[PDB]
Design a protein around this ligand. Structure first.
Ligand code: HEM
Ligand code: HEM
Ligand code: HEM
Ligand code: HEM
Lengths: 146, 142, 146, 142
């Protein structure tokens, strides 16, 4: 959509200081215990049986890292987000068959991890900006479903 | 929660429409996969995900049978449906958000099929009840 | 955005035979009893004490018929729905202070009331096309909110 | 519904963060009005729906007082909040959808303010509880 320069700058700032190795695992691990039905799509990963197992699971950790990098295309092309996820959106539906509502749940977990890390720095305006971006990305991933 | 009033409305309506539950089920689940296509991922293991098909006619009879049971356990959906609830959590892993979607589609089918009976008062009670079932189904998820 | 020709025919069909004087009152009355908080904005109307009263309130009847006719602009503006409600959205946002979630709810009451009237002819594909339209209008009404 | 585990988790967490409930509330509501602009319509009766406002700081203190009450009534929130519910139901007429919004803003505030405490285990049970509260508040809506 329309982006204010401040939003562009907020997204830019956040992405520039992001510890993907720390945030990715934690956001993915968080989602798997807070919305446990998301476990359905990760059979092979191993132990997903309780919070401890999930949160020390290497497979899970690595995939949280990919998922977050998944936003990289997005903020690196703020005016063509819809287009940038066409292929990922096709994969998620026709080859992975994941319920799109789960993108919201994981989006919120990413948001909540970012908040812990950034603390005081995650102002409402940062939260509005960050959530606005993620909503754009989420709409984009559930676009090629039908 | 459901008032004695609410429990009463749901019971008299089912008393009325209970016979056509098979028509409701087929129609509702069918409507579901057409208007909200993203819900078909849960039936991605099947060979015939389309309205009227044997299986939609199949999963349909079961779902309304759950509603039939729910009417029967209307004084305690939590206890009454723990059997089904652990199935959708662990065995099916259906994101509960989809319950909202199904609940809408059943309200619409019942309005097509029983326009006289499905008054606003019945509607509010049934919507309250299906939310009540939706929660009951979510009981064992997390 | 985008509409299929059949989606076009369906909506044109539906409207061309819509008994607005009938459908309106019933959808707005219906909404007021199943989502009773929506009564908040119709103080001056009078009685919202019981279901009976609401369903026999003339003002509500006159207002649902009006709100149903509201949809016309959008139906006569299929590819620019947001622009057709921008002011209606400001009207709703700055003057009347209506919470936009209620737009989704009244839409659902309209869907259910038409469904009653249209019965078997209210097919799943019919439903999809009408709901998609009702969905576009509601995105449009909540636009000037901030 | 809340488990004993859930119940122990909200109490230990509420026990841990309860000191700064006045700040949690102000920041949550601030966040709500700024990120979910639609919610300001309920405060149009005020002249200044702005972050950290004189008034904003107050209803915030108000809301977390209701959250602490909810913790102390956690074994029967429905009865514990009948008064709170009659007010949003009867007096304010606030769409339940917004309860959801506030809840997400509350998780963010606590996550910002108490990152070690807000573990994913604290989260799921806390999120279970805030959904639990929202429904208690909806109790006298319809
Ligand atoms: C912001 C939301 C998300 C983004 C940006 C995203 C992005 C990605 C990316 C970049 C990949 C790698 C594909 C490749 O190799 O090209 C992927 C794969 C995958 N995603 Fe997502 N994803 C998101 C949410 C989800 C959610 C919520 C789930 C299910 C709970 C999910 C399930 C999967 C699965 C199962 C894979 C395949 C990995 C494998 O082969 O094991 N995704 N996603
Ligand atoms: C009104 C709410 C629902 C009720 C009462 C209900 C009830 C049932 C019942 C009784 C079964 C049979 C399984 C058994 O007894 O072993 C079943 C299976 C199933 N349900 Fe549900 N269900 C509901 C909603 C949903 C929704 C919304 C979905 C997904 C969109 C869903 C997906 C499934 C699937 C995939 C199966 C298994 C069939 C197969 O093998 O493909 N259910 N359901
Ligand atoms: C399909 C969604 C809706 C449409 C198309 C719509 C359309 C309209 C129109 C055409 C008017 C007339 C404006 C005027 O009087 O100048 C209006 C006014 C109004 N609307 Fe809506 N509306 C919608 C949803 C809602 C909802 C959900 C509510 C309440 C929660 C609402 C509350 C009002 C009120 C209180 C008025 C002013 C009464 C008056 O005309 O004096 N509207 N709306
Ligand atoms: C965590 C969920 C909530 C809790 C615990 C809560 C609790 C409270 C409490 C304790 C009061 C004090 C009574 C009074 O002010 O007269 C109150 C009033 C009020 N609440 Fe809430 N509430 C919640 C959600 C909401 C939401 C989501 C909204 C708006 C969208 C809202 C809007 C109001 C308003 C406008 C008042 C009255 C204003 C005044 O103080 O004069 N509440 N609420």
């Amino acid at each position: 959509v329309e982006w204010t320069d401040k939003e562009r700058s907020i997204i830019s700032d956040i992405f520039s200081h992001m510890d993907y190795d720390d945030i990715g695992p934690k956001a993915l691990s968080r989602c798997l215990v807070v919305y446990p039905w998301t476990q359905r799509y990760f059979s092979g990963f191993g132990n997903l049986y309780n919070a401890e197992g999930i949160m020390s699971n290497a497979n899970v950790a690595a995939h949280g890292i990919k998922v977050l990098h998944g936003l990289d295309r997005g903020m690196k092309n703020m005016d063509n987000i819809a287009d940038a996820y066409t292929d990922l959106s096709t994969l998620h539906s026709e080859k992975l068959h994941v319920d799109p509502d789960n993108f919201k749940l994981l989006s919120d977990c990413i948001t909540i991890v970012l908040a812990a890390k950034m603390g005081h720095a995650f102002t409402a305006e940062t939260q509005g900006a960050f959530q606005k971006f993620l909503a754009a990305v989420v709409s984009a991933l559930g676009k090629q479903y039908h | 929660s459901l008032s004695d009033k609410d429990k009463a409305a749901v019971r008299a309506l089912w008393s009325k429409i209970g016979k056509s539950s098979d028509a409701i089920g087929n129609d509702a689940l069918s409507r579901m996969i057409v208007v909200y296509p993203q819900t078909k991922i849960y039936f991605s293991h099947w060979p015939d995900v389309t309205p009227g098909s044997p299986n939609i006619k199949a999963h349909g009879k079961k779902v309304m049978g759950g509603i039939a049971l729910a009417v029967s356990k209307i004084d305690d959906l939590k206890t009454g449906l723990m059997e089904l609830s652990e199935q959708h959590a662990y065995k099916l892993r259906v994101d509960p958000s989809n319950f909202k979607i199904l609940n809408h589609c059943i309200l619409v089918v019942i309005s097509t099929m029983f326009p006289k009976e499905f008054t606003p008062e019945a509607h509010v009670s049934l919507d309250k009840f299906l939310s009540g079932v939706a929660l009951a189904l979510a009981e064992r998820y997390r």
